[PDB]
Structure formats: C-alpha cells, structure tokens
C-alpha cells in the first residue's frame, strides 16, 4: 500500500486480493506490531481510535455518449428511482475548479438490472460542461449499500471527474506515412508536445495482435479540431492494423489545457482504412489516384465496375455523368489508371473520391484486404504539369498550361520550378512569372545551365502556382517535357549566304 | 488446444478450448477439427499452431508455426418454391447492394446431373437474417440440378459488410439441390396443410408408427421435439400434404419439418426433400366463441394465446387484421375503430359510430394479415384464414324493476320482427325465484326492449333476485331478413341484479 496526498490530508491507499471483495458493514484496524507505515513514527494500536468503520462511494464516473454517464458502484446497490427529485437527492454535479453551477444538468436516472451502474441522461448535450465533476450528497439516506438494511451511501472529501470515451471513433489512413483519428469533439494536447506525450496517448498494433511500440514521432490538431494527426517516420501499414487510446492518457483532452478532462480509450478498437491521398490528373484524358499502399482491383476490370469506385463531380459539386472509358490498375500497384473519352470531360476545380461501400479496390488483394473508404472532404485534382513547354530563349522558357491559373505574387522561383538533366540532376532557376493571358508561363532559367535534351519539371512542395481558383496548386510530371528549340531570327549578313539564330546546339 | 489455435484479428489471446475433438481422415491428409455444437466463426480469423509443438508429427519433423486464413464455404440448397431455391449459409453474409442476375450468374453455377455446364437464372437477393440466399431458376426443376461457388468470385463475403470480411470459395463437392416445404396452414385442432413444388408419394398400405419416423414437430426456439407420433400422412390437390395430429398434441409457435435424411417419400422415386424447420400459421378454429355483449361492442373468446402492437390500437390496425363479413359473404369498410386483448385471451372490438351490426354477421380473419400474431410474442406464427367465420350471438345488456308489478329488459339488439308470440315472455328468460314468472309481455318500437307482466305483484326483490337468459332457447331471434341471418339469443356471463327505479329524495 502507498499514501498520497492532496487538499483534504494524507491517505492511505490499500488493496484488497481480486477474491475477496468489499463487503458492507466491515472496519480497519491498525495490526498490533506495524512498523512500515509511519508518520513521525510508527503507529501505535488498540486505542478505540484505530477502529473506523467503512462507507460506500461510487467506482467511477464517464461519459459513454453525448448525454449518457455511467456511475460504477462499489458493491450492489438497492436504490429506487422515480423521478428527477430522486436523482438529485443522491447526485450533485459541480465544475473545474470546485465552483458551482446555478442548475442541475439531470434529467433522470436508471438502475442496471444487477444494481451495478446507474445511467445518468442529461437535458442537453450542452449541459455537460468540460471538466464537471459528480458525488453524493450529504446524509442522503436513499442508497444502500447491504439491502435496505444496510448502510447508506456517504460524500467523499473530493468530488470524481466525468472521463469522456471518443465515441463514433474512425481512423483512416491519409498519406504513406499518416493517419488521422476523429474525436466526439474540440480537444486539446498541451502546448509543448513531445514524442514522450505522443506515444503515451495513442497505441497501434498489427494483424496478429502485437504491440508496435513507439512509432509515433509527432502529432497535432486537425482544421476542425476535433481529432488528432499522427505521423511516422516511415511507412508501416498492413491489412489489419488496429488503433485506439491507451490506458494512461494525459494529453488529449476535451476543451481547453488549463481545465479539460483527458480521454479514456474506446470499448472497441478502431481498424484502420486506406482512402485516396491525391488524384493527379497525368494528361488530357487520363486521371491517376495517387495511392498510400498496394492496392488491388477486380481481376477484370469494367467501366460499369470502375463506376462504383469514384465520384467525378465539378466544382460547385455536380456530379459529371460521362466520363470513364476504362480502368487499369498500375504495375506499381500504387496508381489506378481511369481512361477518358475525350478530353473535355475535365474542367478546371473538379474533384474525385471514393465511393462508400464498395467492395472493388481494396488493400494488397480483392479477397481480405479493406476496400478503401470516402474522404471527410472530397480530393481536389491538381493538374500535372504536361502541356506544351517550348524554348523561347536560352534564358526563358514558355509553358502553356491548358488551364486558366493564377500564380502567387512575390513567391520565390525556387520552391516552384526546377529544371532537370541527365540522371536526374537537378539545376537552379533564377526568376519566374504569369502571364496576363492566365494561362501562359515563362521560367527564367540561369544562363548557359539548359543544354538541349534537358527537361523541365516542378519542384515537390511547391505551392506558389495554382488554377484560377487559387486552391489547386499544379505538381510535378513523369517526364516533364522535352523542351523544343524555337529560333529566333536570321541578319542581313551577306546576298548568298545566312546565318540562323538557332537557339541551342 | 496444446497444439492448435484459432485467434481473431488484433487479439491479443487465442480462443480458449475452441476444438472438441480434432480427427485426421483421407490418406492421412485432412486435419477434420470438429468445433463446439454451437460455435463461433469471427471474420476473417487466423488458423496456426502453437510453438514447439509435437502431438502432430510428420517423419521426423514437426510442423512449425505459419499462420493462415480461413476461408468460407456453402453450406446447404433447397428448392422452396417451384422456381426459388434457399441456399444456407454458416454465418452471416453479405452482397454488394445493387446486384444484378448477371452477378450471380458471375459467381453462382447451377449444372446438370454429371455435367460442368451452366444453368441460368433471373436474380438473386440475400435474406433478412443474411444468413440465407435466394435464386430464381430460369428454367424447370429436375432430380440432380446441383449449385456451386465459383473460383474467382469475390462479391460474396462473410460478415455484415462487404468491406471487411472473407469470400466464399468453391467445395470440392458441389451442394446437390433438393427440395422442401413451402408453408403450412393450421386448418383444424387436429389436421394442417402443406405446400410443395412437387410431385409425390404414398406409403403405399400406411402404418400409424411410421409417419412420425419421417417428420417432427419443434417447439418454440426449435430446440425441443414433441414425442408421440402423428395418426396419418397422405397426399392431396394442388400438391399438398396432410398431417393430423393427435388431440392436444400441439402447443402455440411449434414447428414442422421432415428429419434429416429421411428416405420415405421420393419425388420421381430418386430424389427427397432435405430437412427445414417450418413455423404454423394458427386460425380462429372452431373453439373460438363470439358475443354482443352490447349494441356497440363485441367480445371474442381466442382458443389460443395472442398478442397485438402496444394494448390499445387505433382504428387502422384492427381493420388491417379484422373483417365483419356480411350473412351473405361480401366485406364491409372500417367497422372497428378501437380494439384490443387482455390477458391475451380475450379480444375486445367496438363498432365505429360510422359502422353498424347487422343480423348475420360474422367475425373472420383478414386476408393479407400482418399484426395479430399467435403467440404472446411480438414476433411471431401471425392468424391467416379467409374461411369459416364465427356467428356471433347476442344477449341482455340491462335490467331494471318499473314497478312493484313490471320488469323490464333491454337488448342489444333488435327484434323487431312480427315473429313475437307470447311463448318468449315465459321461454326466453329464467328468473330464479319462479318457474314461470310472468303472464304476459310485449315488445317495444324499436325492439330494444320488453315490458313482462308478474304473476305476483312484488315477487321481485329488489337488489337480490337476479334475471338472465335461458342457454339453448330457440324463442329469441335476432331481427334477421332469414333463416340464414337470425341468430339465436344466448346468457350473458353474469346475471343481472334488478334494481328497482324510483324517486331517492
């Protein structure tokens, strides 16, 4: 046994063996010869002051769904409820922060058939104010513990917090490297997250059902803030994996740091879901579902079959009616290849995703691998840079993106255009710009660095250009483009002979 | 155990004593582990074998661990309608929403007797448990047609979603398709009707023993048999098959269904129906007895026990279960607006304002019936019978002392015919003070009530004697257009206590 203390004084914590459990009406005694457990001293025993008969209070206290908290009890209990006076005779709510509310949240109560839970349903789902707290009142004569004989319930000198479950928990898989994890509300992590905090709170597991250990490096708040990003240094993912809260979590919480209560984990673990992270249109009629794992399609694969597994859908979100010709599924197994019938069936903005309940792609085979899931927010399209892109100097090149674009302004060239040689090597560029047209680009290269069979591509990350919109940003292409020289003129040099300004060797 | 598992996926513990008795057949090549009676299949469990084992040995090896999956399979067919066939299943299962006959086509096969070809069909749809499948022969039905799963197919999957879950796989025998039971009507306390699409046969010189041997009668869960035998078994039009029962041999919700593999009866002498529990339709028999007990309400005597939606109803579902069929055969609209049953053997209903009782009429089941149920469960062997209808028979509603020289009675309906004599004044009623009470007697305007002169002045006492109507008289007749239609008056369940009317103060 272990003392720790707080406001009220110092306790003690004792134990008691999983056979033998709490029965009403018994007492603790200090044993004749104690030596361990000492205050200046040890203890002294036999005086009627070392005899304390024991009382009842409540296991524990949760919050199971958005108006539901389930009490545990410390032994089975014969109480009758009735009405809403009832439960507030046994049952006192309070705040964070030993303050007191000006009303009671209750509405009424139930008893569980073998008298070991009472459910407690509030009015609203807004009266449950972060960091509440539940307890007894004082001599409230109604619940026993002992049959109607026995012994009343009693107040404990501190009043229980309310833990919240992440009820309505699903985790899905968004990048290679990331998955989210939704949470019934706006939570909180402290300020000053560490690795340490990170993988203390949450816990991921394979398909036989072994520990991972320590994966998470780092982890954050979602735009809605109601969920937690966890990220990992490489991938990991298998069919099968699992997730959930552990069992000493601290940091996330619901509502603010200074004030919240930190989750419990959920009753069941929540298997993990491959969607759609990217759909990068490749060129005029050929749109490419960037893929976080090994995917697999039906062993044939139909246009009516690849039309229950997207949703093609404008702008505004209509859904566009006529469009796959065919589906192929990559030799990398991290791509799906959907053909166009022409290449009018894109329009700047459009947007792609999956659509539920399908039983076509799926993760590393079409037998037992989870099919993908739909995304919280549709995927936008971004364009791959694939159009024309012709020499127009040995200086400045032109590219004439197909679409209707607009650039950042004052951005720096260097985290948007690259230009790339033999094996790969990349080379700087010096400036860059937009057109007033919207569509056409020019990249200004350094001097003398372009030599003729080099390619120009886009750098990763970048985020400078974008469609009309101003929300999809362009991305790199398999093979750029191979830049064509455009000549730029020829002088009167003599009557017979002349000279052409070719612009490259 | 000590050598083999069986573990879910993300278990962190295997399933504890999961096998009964483990077996090897074949050339010693088919590792047959018989599981419990009543197991549980968890989707897409995992099979292995513990570390170091050595009760399976293999040469001078010992097989060591590698896990696999387990994979499902059909589990029975039968041909329930003439064009319909049940294809069990061992645990739930699923198909991916819109699914077409060319999908099952895709992954079903229906082949000859000794052949490998195909055999088409018009559709399929899973059942309302999803433990049952459903498929339309495209053509007729012969003794041999046997189904199969084909390799390769994938849109059906064990477990409540497609995306989460095994596919079934071919058996290296494909499951022969026999027929079975239809439905089955009760007709009688001891006979009930049987559907088939079938031919059939006798046993030709019958014996009493016997037709029990074949078929069985269920309890409520299935779980129990009844044990004596049945009296007869025989065939008859519209391919039907009869069996009456002994008396007092049936008990409310039981089942019916031939035993498994019984050989007794053969459709074209080489093929017989397999084993399918079968529940029984109930119908208000001849026991179940009518009354008017007042000009706007009735009372029915249930032979059985019964049950409705909530206790009270409103009009629409008493008449969606209730007929008041004319004394001439046709349907009349909306007679009863509020109904209910009480101890669940007493069933109330009570003419509407806009409906009225006619001489004749009878009280008979609906047609298409879908909420009075013959159990006291709400789910359960629901009333179905467009037959016999019982008559229902008026009585004496109310009693009262004119004065020290006259009585008076009200009916419940009337009688206004010229048919009265003065046989009904000392014939129809029995007052137990005197043999013949009366002297005379005369009718009223309406029918609705007779004024009888004493043959005493004041041999009524008030408050004490009591007056009800004789059992089996044949002197009051309702006010009919017929014979057909005049049903005779019968006692009430309690006699009336006259009460003399006069001025209190």
């Given at each position: 046994c272990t003392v720790a203390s707080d406001a009220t004084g110092y306790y003690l914590v004792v134990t008691l063996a999983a056979g033998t459990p709490f029965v009403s009406g018994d007492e603790v005694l200090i044993k004749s010869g104690?030596?361990?457990?000492?205050?200046?001293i040890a203890y002294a025993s036999g005086?009627?002051?070392?005899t304390k008969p024991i009382y009842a209070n409540f296991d524990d206290a949760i919050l199971t769904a958005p108006t539901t908290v389930l009490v545990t009890m410390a032994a089975v209990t014969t109480v009758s409820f009735t009405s809403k006076a009832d439960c507030d005779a046994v049952f006192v709510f309070s705040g964070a922060g030993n303050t007191t509310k000006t009303t009671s949240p209750i509405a009424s109560c139930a008893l569980a058939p073998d008298g070991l839970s009472v459910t407690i349903t509030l009015?609203?789902?807004?009266?449950?104010?972060?960091?509440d707290a539940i307890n007894v009142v004082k001599d409230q004569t109604s619940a026993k513990v002992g049959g109607v004989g026995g012994t009343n319930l009693v107040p404990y000198p501190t009043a229980t917090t309310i833990s919240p479950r992440p009820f309505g928990a699903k985790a899905t898989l968004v990048a290679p490297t990331s998955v989210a994890f939704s949470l019934p509300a706006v939570s909180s992590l402290p300020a000053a997250t560490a690795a340490a905090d990170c993988n203390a709170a949450v816990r991921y597991t394979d398909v036989a059902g072994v520990d991972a250990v320590n994966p998470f490096t780092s982890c954050a708040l979602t735009p809605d803030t109601k969920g937690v990003v966890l990220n990992t240094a490489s991938p990991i993912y298998k069919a099968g994996d699992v997730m959930n809260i552990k069992s000493?979590?601290?940091?996330?919480?619901?509502?603010?740091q200074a004030s919240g209560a930190a989750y419990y984990p959920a009753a069941a673990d929540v298997p993990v879901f491959a969607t759609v992270a990217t759909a990068t249109?490749?060129?005029?009629?050929t749109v490419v579902l960037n893929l976080p794992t090994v995917s697999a399609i039906p062993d044939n694969f139909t246009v009516p079959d690849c039309l229950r597994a997207i949703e093609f859908k404008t702008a505004a979100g209509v859904t566009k009616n006529g469009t796959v010709a065919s589906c192929m599924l990559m030799p990398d197994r991290l791509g799906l290849q959907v053909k166009l019938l022409?290449?009018?069936?894109f329009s700047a903005g459009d947007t792609v995703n999956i659509k539920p309940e399908?039983?076509?792609?799926?993760?590393?085979?079409?037998?037992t691998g989870p099919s993908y899931v739909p995304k919280l927010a549709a995927q936008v399209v971004n364009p791959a840079l694939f159009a024309n892109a012709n020499l127009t100097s040995a200086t400045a090149i032109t590219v004439r993106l197909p679409f209707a674009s607009a650039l950042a302004t004052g951005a720096d060239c260097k985290a948007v255009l690259a230009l790339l040689g033999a094996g790969g090597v990349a080379k700087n560029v010096s400036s860059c710009s937009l057109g007033a047209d919207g569509v056409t680009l020019a990249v200004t290269i350094?001097?003398?660095?372009?030599?003729?069979?080099d390619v120009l591509n886009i750098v990763p990350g970048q985020r400078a250009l974008t469609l009309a919109d101003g929300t999809t940003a362009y991305v790199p292409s398999k093979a750029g483009v191979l830049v064509t020289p455009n000549i730029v003129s020829a002088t009167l040099?003599?009557?017979?002979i002349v000279t052409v300004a070719l612009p490259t060797a | 155990n000590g050598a083999f598992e069986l573990r879910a996926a993300g278990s962190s513990a295997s399933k504890s004593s999961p096998f009964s008795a483990c077996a090897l057949a074949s050339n010693n090549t088919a590792l047959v582990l018989t599981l419990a009676s009543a197991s549980t299949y968890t989707a897409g469990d995992i099979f292995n074998v513990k570390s170091g084992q050595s009760l399976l040995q293999v040469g001078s090896t010992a097989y060591v661990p590698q896990a696999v999956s387990v994979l499902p399979t059909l589990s029975t067919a039968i041909?329930?309608?003439?064009?319909?066939v049940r294809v069990g299943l061992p645990v739930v299962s699923s198909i991916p929403?819109?699914?077409s006959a060319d999908d099952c086509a895709r992954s079903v096969i229906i082949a000859a007797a000794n052949s490998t070809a195909a055999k088409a069909i018009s559709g399929c749809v899973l059942s309302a448990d999803g433990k049952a499948l459903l498929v339309t022969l495209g053509a007729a039905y012969a003794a041999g047609d046997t189904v199969n799963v084909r390799t390769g197919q994938w849109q059906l999957r064990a477990?409540?979603?497609?995306?989460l879950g095994p596919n079934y796989i071919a058996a290296s025998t494909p499951v022969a398709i026999v027929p079975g039971f239809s439905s089955a009507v009760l007709t009688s306390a001891t006979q009930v009707t049987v559907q088939l699409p079938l031919a059939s046969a006798l046993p030709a010189?019958?014996?009493?023993?016997?037709c029990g041997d074949a078929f069985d009668l269920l309890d409520a869960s299935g779980t129990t048999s009844r044990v004596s035998p049945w009296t007869g078994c025989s065939i008859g039009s519209n391919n039907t098959l009869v069996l009456n029962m002994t008396a007092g041999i049936y008990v409310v919700g039981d089942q019916v269904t031939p035993k498994?593999?019984?050989?007794?009866?053969?459709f074209a002498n080489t093929t017989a129906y397999g084993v399918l529990l079968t529940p029984i339709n109930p119908i208000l028999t001849a026991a179940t007895t009518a009354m008017l007990?007042?000009?706007?309400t009735i009372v029915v005597a249930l032979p059985y026990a019964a049950n409705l939606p909530a206790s009270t109803n409103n009009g629409t579902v008493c008449n969606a279960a209730f007929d008041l069929v004319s004394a001439a055969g046709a349907s009349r609209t909306a007679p009863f607006s509020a109904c209910s049953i009480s101890g669940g053997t007493t069933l109330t209903l009570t003419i509407a304002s806009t409906a009225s009782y006619t001489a004749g009429d009878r009280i008979n089941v609906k047609s298409?019936?879908?909420?009075?149920?013959?159990?006291?469960?709400?789910s359960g062997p629901a009333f179905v019978h467009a037959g016999t209808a019982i008559v229902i028979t008026p009585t004496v509603v109310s009693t009262a002392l004119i004065s020290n020289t006259n009585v008076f009675v009200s009916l419940?309906?009337?009688?206004?015919?010229?048919?009265?004599?003065?046989?009904?004044?000392?014939?129809?009623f029995d007052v137990?003070?005197?043999?013949?009470?009366?002297?005379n007697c005369t009718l009223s305007a309406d029918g609705t009530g007779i004024s009888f002169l004493l043959?005493?002045?004041?041999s009524v006492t008030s408050g004490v004697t009591t007056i009800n109507v004789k059992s089996s008289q044949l002197f009051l007749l309702a006010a009919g257009s017929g014979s057909s239609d005049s049903p005779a008056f019968v006692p009430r369940g309690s006699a009336l206590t006259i009460s003399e009317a006069k001025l209190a103060g």
């Open positions: 104690n030596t361990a457990l000492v205050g200046s005086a009627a002051g070392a009015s609203s789902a807004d009266a449950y104010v972060p960091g000493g979590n601290a940091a996330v919480r619901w509502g603010p249109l490749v060129d005029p009629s022409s290449a009018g069936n399908q039983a076509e792609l799926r993760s590393s085979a079409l037998a350094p001097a003398a660095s372009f030599v003729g069979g040099t003599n009557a017979t | 041909l329930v309608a003439a064009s319909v929403a819109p699914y477990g409540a979603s497609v995306t010189t019958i014996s009493a023993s016997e498994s593999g019984q050989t007794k009866l053969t007990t007042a000009s706007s298409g019936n879908s909420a009075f149920l013959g159990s006291l469960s709400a419940s309906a009337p009688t206004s015919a010229s048919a009265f004599n003065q046989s009904i004044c000392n014939g129809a137990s003070g005197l043999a013949t009470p009366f002297t043959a005493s002045a004041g």
